[PDB]
Amino acid sequence: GSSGSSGKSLTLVLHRDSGSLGFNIIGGRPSVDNHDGSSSEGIFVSKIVDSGPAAKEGGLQIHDRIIEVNGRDLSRATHDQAVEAFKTAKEPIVVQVLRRTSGPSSG
């Protein structure tokens, strides 16, 4: 068989309190430099509104890489897309993040 590789994937349901998922994302730079070094973009959480439905029931976690949102892949998407995704996203919004092992270091 073949299923998995590293890290773990969790699901989180996000909602919209009012044009505010209740958090912020980072990544996606408007620079398409020739392929050589750092390439591809990523969507991560740098902020999270407590009072927001993202921190409330959302389940999100500051410094978390979004894998999918409402079924929309944003792993290689940009803030623009991510934003739009979460914007055009409907509740409940099924989001997935990639979190390392449950217990990092220290057996």
Element of type H or E holding 81: helix 79-88
Q: Domain 1-107 is of which CATH architecture?
A: Roll (2.30)
Experimental method: NMR
Instruction: Report the distance separating Cα 47 and Cα 79, nearest Å.
Output: 13
β-pair partners for 45: 25
**Residue 86 — φ and ψ, nearest 5°?**
-65, -25
Supply angle C-alpha 20, 25, 28, rounded to 5: 130
Quote the distance between the C-alpha of residue 47 and its chain's center.
Answer: 11
**Residue 56 — φ and ψ, nearest 5°?**
-65, -85
Distances in Å between the alpha carbon of 46 and those of 27, 62, 79?
10, 6, 12
Kindly list the domain boundaries of the chain, sorted by start residue: 1-107
CB atoms within 10 A of CB 57: 14
Q: Dig out the tokens for 67 from the structure.
A: 């894998």
Instruction: Report the distance separating Cα 20 and Cα 5, nearest Å.
Output: 34
Residue whose C-alpha is closest to residue 44's, from 67, 72, 12: 67
Helices (H), 41-78: 53
**Residue 47 — φ and ψ, nearest 5°?**
-145, 160
